[PDB]
Design an enzyme around this catalytic site. Structure first.
Site, PDB file in Angstrom:
ATOM      1  N   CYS B 162      84.274  51.555   7.984  1.00  0.00           N
ATOM      2  CA  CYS B 162      84.141  52.987   7.682  1.00  0.00           C
ATOM      3  C   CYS B 162      84.986  53.915   8.549  1.00  0.00           C
ATOM      4  CB  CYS B 162      82.685  53.422   7.809  1.00  0.00           C
ATOM      5  SG  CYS B 162      81.539  52.240   7.175  1.00  0.00           S
ATOM      6  N   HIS B 297      79.506  61.490  10.059  1.00  0.00           N
ATOM      7  CA  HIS B 297      79.624  60.229   9.355  1.00  0.00           C
ATOM      8  C   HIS B 297      78.534  60.188   8.276  1.00  0.00           C
ATOM      9  CE1 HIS B 297      80.578  56.119   8.524  1.00  0.00           C
ATOM     10  NE2 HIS B 297      79.399  55.683   8.925  1.00  0.00           N
ATOM     11  N   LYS B 327      79.333  63.404   2.488  1.00  0.00           N
ATOM     12  CA  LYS B 327      78.976  62.186   1.750  1.00  0.00           C
ATOM     13  C   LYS B 327      77.798  62.386   0.784  1.00  0.00           C
ATOM     14  CE  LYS B 327      80.825  58.430   4.694  1.00  0.00           C
ATOM     15  NZ  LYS B 327      81.270  59.206   5.895  1.00  0.00           N
ATOM     16  N   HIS B 332      80.384  57.320  -0.215  1.00  0.00           N
ATOM     17  CA  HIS B 332      81.006  56.705   0.949  1.00  0.00           C
ATOM     18  C   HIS B 332      82.169  55.832   0.494  1.00  0.00           C
ATOM     19  CE1 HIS B 332      81.870  54.820   4.610  1.00  0.00           C
ATOM     20  NE2 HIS B 332      80.689  54.345   4.963  1.00  0.00           N
ATOM     21  N   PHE B 389      82.124  56.035  11.855  1.00  0.00           N
ATOM     22  CA  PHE B 389      81.552  54.863  12.510  1.00  0.00           C
ATOM     23  C   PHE B 389      81.449  53.736  11.495  1.00  0.00           C
ATOM     24  CE2 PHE B 389      78.977  58.575  14.281  1.00  0.00           C
ATOM     25  CZ  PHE B 389      79.916  58.878  15.265  1.00  0.00           C
ATOM     26  N   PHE B 391      80.855  49.361  10.437  1.00  0.00           N
ATOM     27  CA  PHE B 391      80.193  48.110  10.815  1.00  0.00           C
ATOM     28  C   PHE B 391      81.030  47.420  11.885  1.00  0.00           C
ATOM     29  CE2 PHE B 391      78.042  47.381   6.355  1.00  0.00           C
ATOM     30  CZ  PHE B 391      77.130  48.405   6.629  1.00  0.00           C
TER      31      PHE B 391
HETATM   32  C1  TL6 Z   1      77.690  49.132  13.661  1.00  0.00           C
HETATM   33  C2  TL6 Z   1      77.007  49.611  12.637  1.00  0.00           C
HETATM   34  C3  TL6 Z   1      77.313  50.904  12.023  1.00  0.00           C
HETATM   35  C4  TL6 Z   1      76.560  51.274  10.986  1.00  0.00           C
HETATM   36  C5  TL6 Z   1      76.740  52.573  10.226  1.00  0.00           C
HETATM   37  C6  TL6 Z   1      76.289  53.787  11.040  1.00  0.00           C
HETATM   38  S1  TL6 Z   1      78.429  52.763   9.739  1.00  0.00           S
HETATM   39  C7  TL6 Z   1      77.988  52.987   8.153  1.00  0.00           C
HETATM   40  O1  TL6 Z   1      78.815  53.336   7.332  1.00  0.00           O
HETATM   41  C8  TL6 Z   1      76.709  52.776   7.867  1.00  0.00           C
HETATM   42  C9  TL6 Z   1      76.158  52.851   6.476  1.00  0.00           C
HETATM   43  C10 TL6 Z   1      75.973  52.486   8.932  1.00  0.00           C
HETATM   44  O2  TL6 Z   1      74.685  52.127   8.867  1.00  0.00           O
END
Ligand code: TL6
Ligand code: TL6
Lengths: 404, 403
Positions: B162, B297, B327, B332, B389, B391
C-alpha cells in the site's frame, strides 16, 4: 557524501548454499545446472535449471515461514548468513531506526499466485486459499518477509527491475548511506524457481532448448551455439554499511562501493540498445581513479544480448578492456537474485585474488574477438571489479567495487 | 537540492483526469460499485473501486501488447502528467537527466494465472504467447513506460504493498536531492481482478457486510467498518528539481518538503503504530509550518484506522490537523494509492478545499476529539501530509507545501 562498504554477505545459489561452497564452485568452474523433471512435465521445451540444492525444512521458524514464498525463504537464509558474516548481533541491528532493508524479486511468486487462483476455483474457495497468499505473492514479498522477523526499523521496500532487481537494491542502499539516512542497509533479493514462471520465458523463446540431454553445457555465454539463458532460483544479501560506522566497530570490509550506474534504454522491451549500457558503465566508472581489473558481465547466453554488451564494453574501454567472465555459464540466470549473487561472486574474486572462468566456450563468437574473456580459473591480485545487470524494459544497473 | 511537483495525471475510480477527480472530491462522490466478477469468483466481498473507462485503442498496439492493466493505467496517467507539465518530447525524451520510478503492489496476478492456465491446456506454450513476462513481472509498470516514453535516466519500480507509489515519489525526490536527475516521473498502477482480490478476502481484509449498498461499504472511522474496498487505477506526478522548473516557467503545485520512510519490524499484516509515528516525525524534520490537512492511509479496517489515529495524536498532540480518509470515496487502489492520494492532496492544496471523510454514521469513540472533516470545507491550505502504510510493516509519508 558518505562512503559505503560491504561488511558481510550471504548466498543461496545453484553453485552453493553459502559463500564457502560458492567459492569452491567458482574456482573449480563447477556447473549448478541440472535436468528438471518439473519443467519437462509442464510441457516446456527447456528442461534445464539452476536449482537450489538445499532442504529448507525446519530452517525458518514455523510462524515466520508461513508468510513466505521461496524467493523470501532464499533471501531470509542469505540474510541470516550475512548478519553472522558481518559480526552483527540483535542489539546492534534490531529495533534500530538507522538500519534498513532494500531487497526484491523479479517475479514475486507466480507459484502462490497460481495456487491462490487454483484453490479459489475449487469447491472450498476462500477456505482453500488461506490467509497467507498476499504476503507470498505480493511484489514486495521479499522485503516484507525479512524486515518484520529481523525487527528492522529503518527503510523497508523492494526494488524490481527484472534482471537488474537486486543490483538496483544494492545501489539504492548505497544512496541511503550517502544521504546520511541509514548506517546499515541489508540489500539483495531472491527468486523462486518454478514452471509457473519459467514457462513465460520459454513462450517468448528466451530459454535454452537444444542442450537438455547435457544440462551442464546448456548455459554457454559467448559460445557461437548458445540458444538462450538457463533459468535459475536462489537468493543473495549483502550488508551495506557507512564507512566510519564499519571502522569504529572493527568490521571486516570486503570492498567499497565506489561506483553505481543506473540508466534506461528507452528503446526496446526485450532487446538491449547498447547505448544505455555504455552510459551505465561510464556512470559507475565516474571519478574512480583506478582501472577495472575484472568485469562480471550480465552475459546471459543469448544470441543478440551477449554480443550487444560486448560492443558496449568495447565502446567504454576501447583497447584497454578488463578481464571478462560470465558466471551465468556456471550458475544460470536467477533473474531478480542475479545482481546480488553476481556482486557476491565478484567480491569473492576480489577477496580471494582470482578470476572465475567463463565456461562452455567451445567456439568463441566471432564478435567477441579482441577482448580478454577468461576461460580458465586464473589467480590475480585484483583491486577494482565491475558487475553488469541489464534487464527487460531496458533497465540497466552497474556496480563497481574496490578494496580499501 | 529541492524537489517540486510540476505535473500530474490520474486514472481512478472517481475520475479519469484531474478535473473529474476534483469534482468528485468536492462532492464527496463515491467511486465504488457492485462487482459481478468478484461475486462470480466465490468471494464474500462483491464491491470495488473500478476505473470507469474502456482503455481499448488508447495505446499503440505495438506498445500495449506488452502491458497489463497496472501498466495501462500508469501509462495513461503519465501522458496526462507530461501534458500537464508542459513537456515537449525534446524536453524529456532521450535525456539521461530524466527518469522513471513507478510500481505496483501485485504486478499482474491475472497474467501470472493466465500463463499457468494456458500452459496446462492443449496448446501449451503457443497459448501462453510471448507477452506474459512483461505483463506479469513485478517491474512491469516501470518497464512498460520507460521504453515507449524514451526514458534515458533511472528506470525501476519500488514495491511496498500500500506504500508502493508513495516510496516511488520519495525515491524520485532523493534522485533530485543527489543531483542525479532533473526530472523523475513517479507513481504507479494496479490492476483490478478477482485473482488478486480473493487473496485479500481470504485473509479477511475486505469489506463484506455492505454488498447491497456498495457506496456505503468504504467507511473509514465509522463504528461499523468491516474492511477495505479493493480498487484499481493509476497515477503519475512529475518530480522536478526547482531551478529546472523555474527556468522553463513550469507551473508548480508544491514542493516536497518532507519524506518519511520507516519499518515496523513487528507484525506482517497489522500495523504497530510505533513505526508510523517515526515515519511522520521523519517527514516533519525541518518543516516549521503547521500541517493544515492530513490525507490518512485510513483504509476502513477495524484495527488499522484507529492505529493510525493514535499515531497522529502522538505526533501532533493537541495541534492535530484537519483529517479526511479519501478511501471512503475511492476504495483502496493498493500500489496506486500513494500517488493518487498525493494527487488528491495536491488538488486540495491548489484549489483551497478539504475533501470530506464520508460514510461516518457513527464516529468511533477512539476518534473522539480529533478534527475529522466530514463535509467539503473551503480553506486556504499551505502544507499537507499524506500517509501510506503497507503490509509487511512498510511506512511512507509525504509532506507537500505551496510555494
Ligand atoms: C503491517 C500491516 C499494515 C496494515 C495496514 C494498516 S496497511 C493496509 O492497507 C491495511 C488494510 C492495513 O490493515
Ligand atoms: C531490454 C531488454 C533486455 C534484454 C536482455 C539483454 S536482459 C536478459 O536477461 C535477457 C535474456 C535479455 O535478452
Amino acid at each position: 557524501m558518505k562512503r559505503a562498504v560491504i561488511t558481510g554477505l550471504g548466498i543461496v545459489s545453484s553453485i552453493g548454499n553459502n559463500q564457502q561452497e560458492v567459492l569452491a564452485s567458482l574456482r573449480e568452474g563447477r556447473s549448478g545446472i541440472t535436468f528438471s523433471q518439473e519443467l519437462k512435465d509442464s510441457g516446456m521445451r527447456s528442461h534445464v535449471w539452476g536449482n537450489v540444492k538445499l532442504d529448507t525444512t525446519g530452517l525458518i521458524d514455523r510462524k515466520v515461514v508461513r508468510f513466505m514464498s521461496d524467493a523470501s525463504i532464499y533471501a531470509f537464509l542469505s540474510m541470516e548468513q550475512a548478519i553472522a558474516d558481518a559480526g552483527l548481533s540483535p542489539e546492534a541491528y534490531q529495533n534500530n531506526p538507522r538500519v534498513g532493508l532494500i531487497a526484491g524479486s523479479g517475479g514475486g511468486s507466480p507459484r502462490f499466485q497460481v495456487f491462490g487462483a487454483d484453490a479459489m476455483r475449487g469447491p472450498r474457495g476462500l477456505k482453500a486459499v488461506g490467509p497467507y497468499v498476499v504476503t507470498k505473492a505480493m511484489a514486495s514479498g521479499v522485503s516484507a518477509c525479512l524486515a518484520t522477523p529481523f525487527k528492522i526499523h529503518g527503510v523497508n521496500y523492494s526494488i524490481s527491475s527484472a534482471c537488474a532487481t537486486s543490483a538496483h537494491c544494492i545501489g539504492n542502499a548505497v544512496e541511503q548511506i550517502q544521504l546520511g539516512k541509514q548506517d546499515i542497509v541489508f540489500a539483495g533479493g531472491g527468486e523462486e524457481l518454478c514452471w509457473e514462471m519459467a514457462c513465460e520465458f520459454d513462450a517468448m523463446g528466451a530459454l535454452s532448448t537444444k542442450y537438455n540431454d547435457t544440462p551442464e553445457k546448456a548455459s554457454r555465454t559467448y559460445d557461437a551455439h548458445r540458444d538462450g539463458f538457463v533459468i535459475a532460483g536462489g537468493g543473495g544479501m549483502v550488508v551495506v554499511e557507512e564507512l566510519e560506522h564499519a571502522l569504529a566497530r572493527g568490521a571486516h570490509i570486503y570492498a567499497e562501493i565506489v561506483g553505481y550506474g543506473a540508466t534506461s534504454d528507452g528503446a526496446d522491451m526485450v532487446a538491449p540498445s547498447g547505448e544505455g549500457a555504455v552510459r551505465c558503465m561510464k556512470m559507475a566508472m565516474h571519478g574512480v581513479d583506478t582501472p577495472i581489473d575484472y568485469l562480471n558481465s550480465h552475459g546471459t547466453s543469448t544470441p543478440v544480448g551477449d554480443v550487444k554488451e560486448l560492443a558496449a564494453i568495447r565502446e567504454v574501454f576501447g583497447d584497454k578492456s578488463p578481464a571478462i567472465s560470465a558466471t551465468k555459464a556456471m550458475t544460470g540466470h536467477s533473474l531478480g537474485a542475479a545482481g546480488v549473487q553476481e556482486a557476491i561472486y565478484s567480491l569473492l574474486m576480489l577477496e580471494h585474488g582470482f578470476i572465475a572462468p567463463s565456461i562452455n566456450i567451445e567456439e568463441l563468437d566471432e564478435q567477441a574477438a579482441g577482448l580478454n574473456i577468461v576461460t580458465e580459473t586464473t589467480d590475480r591480485e585484483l583491486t577494482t571489479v565491475m558487475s553488469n545487470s541489464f534487464g527487460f524494459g531496458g533497465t540497466n544497473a552497474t556496480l563497481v567495487m574496490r578494496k580499501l
